Subunit: 124 residues, 2 copies
Amino acid sequence: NHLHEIRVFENFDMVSFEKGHVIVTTEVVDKSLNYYGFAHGGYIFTLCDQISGLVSISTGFDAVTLQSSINYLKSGKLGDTLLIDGRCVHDGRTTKVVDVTVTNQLKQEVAKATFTMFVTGKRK
Amino acid sequence: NHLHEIRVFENFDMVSFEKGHVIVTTEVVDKSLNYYGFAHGGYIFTLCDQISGLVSISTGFDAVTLQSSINYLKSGKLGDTLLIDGRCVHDGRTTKVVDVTVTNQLKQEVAKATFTMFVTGKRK
Ligand SMILES: [Cl-]
């Protein structure tokens, strides 16, 4: 109803984990959805966000996210396989910037986000 | 381990619901958390996003978010009571803009987000 539980990553498949580049798919399920029956904005954002943290790990660093921005282009629907592709855009000393695109099986872009992260330090 | 389920709104309390202004609280629990034991940035954003949709309902409309921006200021921690306050800063015929702030019980800001919405229709 007006407030309800939402879940993210009840399922996933990690397709490729590469330097500054991470691809993961997932399928939209009942608890992915908002009250109008479409994939929830928060759900979509969290897909992007997790992938961006993995991009960040893939360049060697701990880095925390200071700000993000997302555009919602098309609806996610129940049963869609969504492809989440994170790419490092700036791999810096002090900051990182990661772009993420969400895509459906037609390869239409569902959402695009950018995450601006502060480099705390190396990963070991 | 690296990809994992997250849940949002496993508990909540609807504090107030007024024209252009909605307050909800929630308590940070185990499935709110990221690998480091703090509230996940996607869980945080999803709290803001749902509240902004209620703000849009509160001004009498269905709306869909085109774009959001969020700034993370302070970590949420396990057990925290978070207060999510959404306010309509633009209540337009064709667009709505909603600011949401998340604070802890000290009134320290945990995050602030802004949501840019397209009006799809009048409620009922
Ligand atoms: Cl529920």
